[PDB]
Amino acid sequence: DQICIGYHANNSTEQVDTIMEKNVTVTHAQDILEKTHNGKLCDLDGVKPLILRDCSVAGWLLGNPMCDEFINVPEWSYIVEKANPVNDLCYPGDFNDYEELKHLLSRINHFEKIQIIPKSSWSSHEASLGVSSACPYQGKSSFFRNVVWLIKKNSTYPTIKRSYNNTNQEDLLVLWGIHHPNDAAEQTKLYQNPTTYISVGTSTLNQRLVPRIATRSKVNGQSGRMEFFWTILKPNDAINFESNGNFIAPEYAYKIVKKGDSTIMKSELEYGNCNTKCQTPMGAINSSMPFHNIHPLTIGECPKYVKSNRLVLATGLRNSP
Amino acid sequence: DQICIGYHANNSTEQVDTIMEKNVTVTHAQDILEKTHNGKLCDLDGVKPLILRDCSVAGWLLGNPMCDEFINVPEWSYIVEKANPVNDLCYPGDFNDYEELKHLLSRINHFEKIQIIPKSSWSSHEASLGVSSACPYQGKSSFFRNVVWLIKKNSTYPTIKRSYNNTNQEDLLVLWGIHHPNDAAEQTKLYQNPTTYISVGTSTLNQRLVPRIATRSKVNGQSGRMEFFWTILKPNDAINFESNGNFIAPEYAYKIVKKGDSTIMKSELEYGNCNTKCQTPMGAINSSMPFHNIHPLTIGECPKYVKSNRLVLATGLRNSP
Amino acid sequence: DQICIGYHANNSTEQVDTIMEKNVTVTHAQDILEKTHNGKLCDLDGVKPLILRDCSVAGWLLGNPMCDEFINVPEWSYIVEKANPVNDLCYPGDFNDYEELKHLLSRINHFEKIQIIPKSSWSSHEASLGVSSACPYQGKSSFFRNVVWLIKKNSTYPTIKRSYNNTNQEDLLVLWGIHHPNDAAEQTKLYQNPTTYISVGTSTLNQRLVPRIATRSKVNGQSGRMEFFWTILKPNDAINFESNGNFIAPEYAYKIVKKGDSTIMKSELEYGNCNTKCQTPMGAINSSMPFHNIHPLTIGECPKYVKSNRLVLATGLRNSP
Amino acid sequence: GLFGAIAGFIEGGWQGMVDGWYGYHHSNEQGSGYAADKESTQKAIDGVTNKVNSIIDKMNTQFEAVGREFNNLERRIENLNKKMEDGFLDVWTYNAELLVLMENERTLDFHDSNVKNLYDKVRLQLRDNAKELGNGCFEFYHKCDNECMESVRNGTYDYPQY
Amino acid sequence: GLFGAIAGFIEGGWQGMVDGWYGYHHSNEQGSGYAADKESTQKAIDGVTNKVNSIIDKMNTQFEAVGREFNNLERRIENLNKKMEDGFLDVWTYNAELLVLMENERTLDFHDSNVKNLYDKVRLQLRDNAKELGNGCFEFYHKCDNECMESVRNGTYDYPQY
Amino acid sequence: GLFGAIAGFIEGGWQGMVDGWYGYHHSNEQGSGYAADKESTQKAIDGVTNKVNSIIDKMNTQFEAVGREFNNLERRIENLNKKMEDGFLDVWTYNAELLVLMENERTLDFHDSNVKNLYDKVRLQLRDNAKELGNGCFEFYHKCDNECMESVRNGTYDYPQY
Ligand SMILES: CC(=O)N[C@H]1[C@H]([C@H](O)[C@H](O)CO)O[C@@](OC[C@H]2O[C@@H](O)[C@H](O)[C@@H](O)[C@H]2O)(C(=O)O)C[C@@H]1O
Ligand SMILES: CC(=O)N[C@H]1[C@H]([C@H](O)[C@H](O)CO)O[C@@](OC[C@H]2O[C@@H](O)[C@H](O)[C@@H](O)[C@H]2O)(C(=O)O)C[C@@H]1O
Ligand SMILES: CC(=O)N[C@H]1[C@H]([C@H](O)[C@H](O)CO)O[C@@](OC[C@H]2O[C@@H](O)[C@H](O)[C@@H](O)[C@H]2O)(C(=O)O)C[C@@H]1O
Ligand SMILES: *[C@@H]1O[C@H](CO)[C@@H](O)[C@H](O)[C@H]1NC(C)=O
Ligand SMILES: *[C@@H]1O[C@H](CO)[C@@H](O)[C@H](O)[C@H]1NC(C)=O
Ligand SMILES: *[C@@H]1O[C@H](CO)[C@@H](O)[C@H](O)[C@H]1NC(C)=O
C-alpha cells in the first residue's frame, strides 16, 4: 500500500519563455497581447470620424471648391487625412502656422460655419471675379469658397476698413489671405495701387502684410501665390481689417462649439461602416487584452501599445511529455 | 524534552504588498516615500526667493510702476510668479522672445541695475512726457521706469544716434522698445516724421524695426501697442541705436553679477517666513526619505519624485495572527 | 567508506554584486561592458570621415578661402567639426537656418560641386572686385569662393534677372546672400541704387530680402554684414533671382549625389590613420561586449551606451576561501 | 526547477488528476485513485491570479503616442519628437518582455515549491511509519485502507495508532 | 512561502522571542525558554540592510523635471515637453513600484529560507537521536539538560555521546 | 544561500574537482577521488548561457543619442533635447545595473539549488543504507567498492541488494 504526491498534466502545447529556458510547455497560460484588428476605420463610440477623403485640412477649412462634401461637417470623433491629399491649396501658396492650427484641431470636435463679412456687402470693390483656372468647379474657374478675392472696380481699389465683433459665445477661427502677384503690371492690373498692404488687428494681433513680387515657377498653372493666415478671435473681441489691394477677405469663419479629445489620424483607408471603442490608422481594435502591437497612434479606450510579437504568461505548471 | 526552531512575532500591523499577495502584515517595515510638506514658500538654504507677488517677470524687468517693490532686488535662490500676474505690461503689447529670456533667468541669481543712457541727456527730444493712463502711479500717469518714451520737441524729432560700450565685466541685459500708434495722425502728433524706424546693432545684433499701423481693440484704455526687445551685450561690446521716432530708449539695463542654479516657480503662495533645503510650488520638504510625491518641479537637495500613493519595503518577516 | 556531494572551487578572484551582497567572489564571471577605446578618429568601414580641421560647415560650404582643402571633398562616412572652428564666416554675419541645414547634412554622404551661374557671365556688373580684408588669401583680399559679390559697373547697377533650371537628377543645394552696409554713403558707393532688394523664387520659395542699415561693432575689421540663405532646388525646378544691389550671387551649388547615414561629430581630435566599425568623438571601439561607457554619440555597429563603471555577470558559483 | 520536485524526484505529472494542480494518488487492496489537494491548489490559484492582475495593473499607466506635425524647416524638432516617442516605446516594450520572462520563471518555481511543500507535509506526518521510495511515493508498513489514506490527506494521520 | 517553514510546518511565530529574528525554544525538567540564533539573525540584518541601501542608491540618478514656458503659437513643442516630462515620471514611478513589489516578495522568502536552513542545521546534528515531530520541534530520546540544549545551539551537539 | 547547500551544510567547494560544477567525492579501501556529475553540470551551463544571451538580447533595442544643434535663441528646445537624451540614458543605465544585480543573485541561488538537488537525489537512493553525516557526506553501512560508488552516481544504487 502506498500514497504518492504528484502534480497535474494535460494535453496542452502552450509554451512560455523564461530567462534561462525558451519554449517551455505548460499546462495553462494566458496570452496578454492583442495581435488582430478589423482593418477598417470606424465610428468611435457611435460618433463618426471626419474622413477628409482626398482633401486636406487646408482644402477643407479654406473651402477648396473640390471639397464641397465638407462644406458643413457635423461633430466628429477623430479626423482622417491621407499622407498626400490631392485637394490641398488649389491656388498655390502657403498656409501660415499650419501645423500649429492642426494641433489646435486635435482639441476640437465640432465647427459651426458662420458668415461674418457678406460677399454682397463689398459695394466699392469687385467681389465676384476673384477666381482662377487653378481652382476649377464643374468646368468653370472658381476659388476657395470661404474667403473673397477682391479686385478693383471701375479702375479704383479704395481703402478697405472693416471690423467684425465676436458677439457669439464661442471662440471664432477667422481665416484670411494675401495675394502675391508676378510683376508690377499684374499688381496695377488687379488692384491699381502699386504699393499696398493688409493690416489686421485684434485684442492681441498686430499684423501688417505687404505683397511680395518675385518670378516663380508655375504650380497648377499659376506663378502667383496666396499666403493664408488665421487667428482665434476671443468672445467680445473685434477683428479690424485695413487694405490697399491684394486682400483675400473673410466671408465665413468657423465657430468652435465643442472642444474635446480628438486627433488627426494619417491613413489611406476609407470608412468601414463600423463601430469600435479603440481605433488605429490600420484598423479598429476589440479586445480585453492589456496590450496590443497594431499601431502606437490610437484613439479611444485602448490596450497599451508594445512592439512585441508575443507576450504569454505562465499560469499553470511545466507540462510533462 | 524538546528543542524547537522558530521565528519572531510581534504586535505590528504594518503591511506590505508583493506581486502575488497584497496587504501582508510584517513584523518590521520601512516607509521610503515622503508624503508631507509644510505648505509654505521658504528660504532655500537661508537665501530668500524673489517673490514677484502680483508682478510678472516683464513688469519687474521693464519696471512697471506698480512693481517698485522690485526696483532693486538682492540675490535670490529661486523666483516665484503667479499663474496670471495682474501687473504685467501695463501699456499693452508684446515682449519679444519672452520665454527665451525667462529661460535665461533660470541660470541667474542676481541682477545689478545700472544707468546706461541718462534721462537728462536727451536734450534734442522731449524725454519727460512719455507717460500714459494705462501705467498709473499714485493717481498720476506714469510709465515703465527702465525705458524712456521719447517724443518730439518744439515740433521736431531729429535723428537719434546713441552708443553704449559695455566696459563693465559682467554681461549686460539691455531692454528697449518700439511704439506702434493707431493712425497716421497720431504718428506725426508724437514723432512728426511719418515714416520712421529704429536700428539696433551690436557685435552680433543687426536689427531694424519699423512701426506698424493697424486699428486695434482697446486694452487697458489703449489701442496703441508697445513691442519690447532685448539682447545680452557681451563685455567690451557696444550697442548702437539710431531712430526717427517711436523709440523707447533704454535708461537702465541689468548687470548679470551672479550666474547659477535658479528656477521660475509658478505658485499662488506668498512667503512663509521659513527655511528649507528642498522647495516645491506647494510647500517645502524636510525628510530623509529617498522618494516623495508632492510635486515634480522641485529646487534644492530633494528626494526623487514619484506618482505613488505608497511605497513600503518589507524588512522583517510575515507576522503571525 | 563514504560518498560526498560537493561543488567546484578555483583560484578565481573575480567578484560580482547582488542586491543583498557586494563583492562576492565567484569561480567564473563575464564582463559585458567595454571600457576602452583607441583614442583616435578612424575610417568607418574603410570610408574616411570628412575632417573639417579648422573650418566650419559654413566655411566649407560657402567656400571660405582658408578652406580650400575642402574645395572638392569625396564621399564621407561622418563629419568632424571642432567646438569653435576659427575659419567660419570670415566676413562677419549670419547663416540663415544654419542648424536646419546641418541637420540635413546628417543624411548626406556626398556632395558634387557644380557651376550654375558662371562668374564671367556678369557682363553688366562688376564681378571681380567683390573682396575684403576679412577674407584674405595668400596675403591678398579674397572672398567666399562659391558666391560672387557683385558691385556696380561704370557707376550703374542695372536690375539683375537670372534663372537656373535644375535639369540634373539630384536635389541641388543652392546658397546665396545679401550684403548689409554701414551707411547710406556705402550703399551708393557699391551699388548706386539707394533702396534695393533681392527677390528669390522657386516652386515653393517666395523670398524678398531688403538690406538693413545699422551702426555695428567691427568684427574681423568690418562693420558691414553678410546674411547667407539657402534652399534645396528639386529636379526640373527653376530658381529665379532679381536684384537691385547687395546681392551675393551663386556661382557654385552642390549636387546631392548620395543620401544616407551620416553624422556631424564634435571633436578636437585629428585623423588617426585608422579603421573601425564603431566610432565615437573620443576614439574608436572594437569589441563584442553588448555595452560600453565611452560616449553616447556613436556611429556604426556599436554596443549600447550606459553610464556604468562596471557590469559583470555571475556565470559560476560562490567561490570558497 | 529550483525546488527539485516537478520534473525532478517526481518524474512527471498526472493526466489522471483532473480537478487540481497538486494532490495524491493512493494504492491499496480496495483500489486506487487520484485526489486533488484543495488547499494548496486554491493557494496557487490565488497567487497566480494576483500576479496576472498585478502585472496588468502596473502597465496601466504607460506612454501614449500623439500625432504632431512639422514643416520642412522644423526637421530638428520633428526628429526629436520621433526619437522621444520611439524611445518610450522601447522602454515599455522592454519592461513588458522582461517582466513576463522573469515572472514566468517565478511562476514555474512557485508550482515546484508548492509540490515540494505538499510532499514534505506528508513526509513529516508519516515519519518512520512508511518507506520513502524516492519518487514521490511512500510505501506504508501497516495496511492503509481508504479511511487511513484519507487521514494522510486530512493532516490527521494518527502516527501513534500505527 | 517558497521554503515551507514560515507559516508552513512552523505554524506561527513567537511573541516571546524578542532579541532575534530566528532562534530556538527549549523544554526540559529545568524549565523552558527562548534563545535567538545570533548568526542567522545578523546575516538577515546585513542582507535586508544592503537591499534597502541598494534600492535607495539605484534610484539616486533619476529624471528631474524643469520648468519651460511656451507662447500661444508654440503649442506643439509645449505638448512635446509635457509628454516628455510625464513619460519619464511614469517610467520611474513604474520602476519604483515594481522594484518594491518584487523585492518585498524576495525579502519574505529570504526569511522563510533562513528559518528552513536553521531547522535543517539542527536536524542534521540530531540525526536519529531525536524524533522529528513535524512542527519545528525535535523530541529527544535522551534527557537533554541546559548544557545539552546549549550544544545543539552551539553546533556542538555530540551525537556519539548520546 | 537560499537553498542552504553552498557555503551552508556543505562548508566549502573542491579545488580538486576540475571537470564540472557539481559532483561527488568517494573514499573506500581502494582509494578516493572526484567525479563531476555531467547531467546537472550541463543543465547549469545551458541555463546560465541562456540567461546571458537573454540579457544581451533584451538590451538590443535601446535608446541611441543623435547630435542636434541649436542657436542662441533656441535654448528651451536645446535644454529639452538634453534632458530627453540624458533621461533615456539614466533609464537604460538603471535597467542594466538592476538586471545585472537581480540576475546575479538568481544565478548564485540557481547553483545552490542545483547542489541541494544533487545531494537530495543521492539521499533518496541511499535511504537507510548510509548515515547522513551532516556535511554533504554519506557514510555507508556496507562496504562500497568502486562499482558500488559508481551505481550511486549512476542513479542505479540497488538498495535491496544492501
Ligand atoms: C481675380 C483675377 O485676376 N483672376 C485672374 C487670375 C489672376 O490675374 C492671376 O492668377 C494672378 O497671378 O489669372 C487668371 O489667368 C491666369 C491664367 O491665364 C490662362 O490663360 C493660362 O492658361 C494660365 O496658365 C494662367 O496664366 C487665372 O486663371 O488664374 C485669370 C483670372 O480671372
Ligand atoms: C507720450 C504720449 O503721447 N502720451 C499720450 C498717449 C499716447 O499719445 C497714446 O497712448 C499713443 O497711442 O495717449 C494718452 O491719451 C490716450 C488716452 O486718452 C484719454 O483721454 C482716454 O481716457 C484713454 O482711453 C486714451 O485714449 C494716454 O494716456 O495714453 C495721453 C498720453 O499723454
Ligand atoms: C566689394 C567692396 O566694396 N569691397 C571693399 C569693402 C566693402 O566696401 C565694405 O566691406 C562694405 O562694408 O571694404 C573694404 O574696405 C574696408 C576696410 O578698409 C580698410 O582700409 C580698413 O583697414 C578695414 O578696417 C576696413 O574698413 C574691405 O576690405 O572690406 C575694401 C573692399 O575692396
Ligand atoms: C521556440 O519556438 C518558436 C516558434 O515555434 C521557434 O521559431 C523558435 O526557434 C524556438 N526557439 C528556441 C530557442 O528553440
Ligand atoms: C463688441 O460689442 C460688444 C457689445 O455689442 C461690446 O461690449 C464689446 O466691448 C465690443 N468690442 C470691443 C470693445 O472690442
Ligand atoms: C489593502 O489595504 C488597503 C488600505 O487599508 C485597502 O484599502 C485595500 O482595499 C486592501 N487591498 C486588498 C487587495 O485587499
Ligand SMILES: *[C@@H]1O[C@H](CO)[C@@H](O)[C@H](O)[C@H]1NC(C)=O
Ligand atoms: C569699448 O571701449 C573699450 C575701451 O574703453 C575698447 O577696448 C572696445 O574695443 C570698445 N568697443 C568696441 C570696439 O566695440
Ligand SMILES: *[C@@H]1O[C@H](CO)[C@@H](O)[C@H](O)[C@H]1NC(C)=O
Ligand atoms: C568592493 O570592491 C571595490 C573595488 O575593489 C571597493 O572599492 C569597494 O569599496 C567594495 N565595496 C564594498 C561594499 O565593500
Ligand SMILES: *[C@@H]1O[C@H](CO)[C@@H](O)[C@H](O)[C@H]1NC(C)=O
Ligand atoms: C526646366 O526645363 C525642363 C526641360 O529643359 C522643363 O521640362 C521644366 O519644366 C523647366 N522648369 C520649369 C518649368 O520650372
Ligand SMILES: *[C@H]1O[C@H](CO)[C@@H](O)[C@H](O)[C@H]1NC(C)=O
Ligand atoms: C478525516 O478523515 C478521518 C478518517 O477518515 C475522519 O475520521 C476525520 O473525521 C476527518 N478529519 C478531518 C479534519 O477531515
Ligand SMILES: *[C@H]1O[C@H](CO)[C@@H](O)[C@H](O)[C@H]1NC(C)=O
Ligand atoms: C558550547 O556549549 C558546550 C556545552 O555547554 C560547551 O562545553 C562548549 O564549550 C561550547 N562550545 C562553543 C563553540 O560555544
Ligand SMILES: *[C@H]1O[C@H](CO)[C@@H](O)[C@H](O)[C@H]1NC(C)=O
Ligand atoms: C552503472 O554502474 C553499474 C555498476 O558499475 C553498472 O553495472 C551499470 O551497467 C551502470 N548503469 C548505468 C545506467 O550506467
